[PDB]
Structure 1
């Protein structure tokens, strides 16, 4: 169902959380070779998650589940805000700009933290 597809999407999102915290530790420790690899892994995870979320939203639309569509439209908008912040972070790493990297890191944490009450609301709505 769309609901089991959301659980799969939720798991991929939690994998990115796990990899992110590992990456944050490696950044603080100055292990740039690890950070590079973790950023590549995160890019692949976010790409996957985005694809699953789009399929869920399109299916909710085809099902006429108006509440789930409303919540998913907002949640995807937020996801893109996290995605832009992540991409800026990747560029800061390429450029060697640790000050910007720290800034983007914290902002991506707070954006993700904010978008969690909605994530739970979607699970219940699908």
Structure 2
């Protein structure tokens, strides 16, 4: 069902949360080789999560589930804010800018944390 597809998307989101926090620790410890590999893993995970979310929104649309479509539209916009900050973080890392990297890292945390309020409401609506 769309509901079980959302639970799979939720798990993939949780995987990125896990990899993010082991990356933040690696960044703080100065282990740039690790950070590079975690950033590649996160990019893949975010690409997969976006693809599961789009397929869930398209299916809720075909199903006429208006409340779910509203919530998923609001979520996909916030998800894009996260994506943009993530990509900026990656570029900060490429450029050797630890100041901006720290900034984007803290911002992505606040975007992702705020997002979970909606993420939890979508589960209950599908």
Q: Is TM > 0.5 for Structure 1 vs Structure 2? A: yes
TM-score range, shorter chain: over 0.9
Q: Distance in 2 between matches of 1:91 and 1:45?
A: 18
Shift of 1:26: 0.1
Question: Which residue pairs with 1:12 in the alignment?
Answer: 12
Offset at 1:98?
A: 0.2
RMSD value, Cα: 0.2
Structure 2 distance, partners of 1:120, 1:91, is 31
Looking at structure 2, the residues matched to 99 and 88 of structure 1 have their Cα atoms a distance apart, in angstroms, of: 12
The alpha carbon displacement at 1:40 in A equals: 0.1
Deviation of the 1:78 alpha carbon: 0.2
- For structure 2, list consecutive stretches of 5 or more residues without a partner in the other structure: none
CA-to-partner distance for each residue in 1:61-119, whole Å, 9 max, x for gaps?
Answer: 00000000000000000000000000000000000000000000000000001011100
Aligned residues: 126
| Deviation by residue 1:30-65 (Cα, 9 ceiling, x = unmatched) | 000000000000000000000000000000000000
What is the rounded CA distance, in whole Å, between the counterparts of 1:117 and 1:86 in structure 2? 20
Distance 1:124 1:37 in 2: 35
Return structure 1 stretches of 4+ with deviation > 2 angstroms: none
Gaps of 5+ in 1: none
User: Once the 2 structures are TM-superposed, how far is the Cα of residue 20 of structure 1 from its aligned partner?
Assistant: 0.1
Deviation at 1:17, TM superposition (A): 0.1
Aligned partners of 1:120 and 1:89: how far apart in 2? 26
Question: TM-score with structure 2 length normalisation?
Answer: 1.00
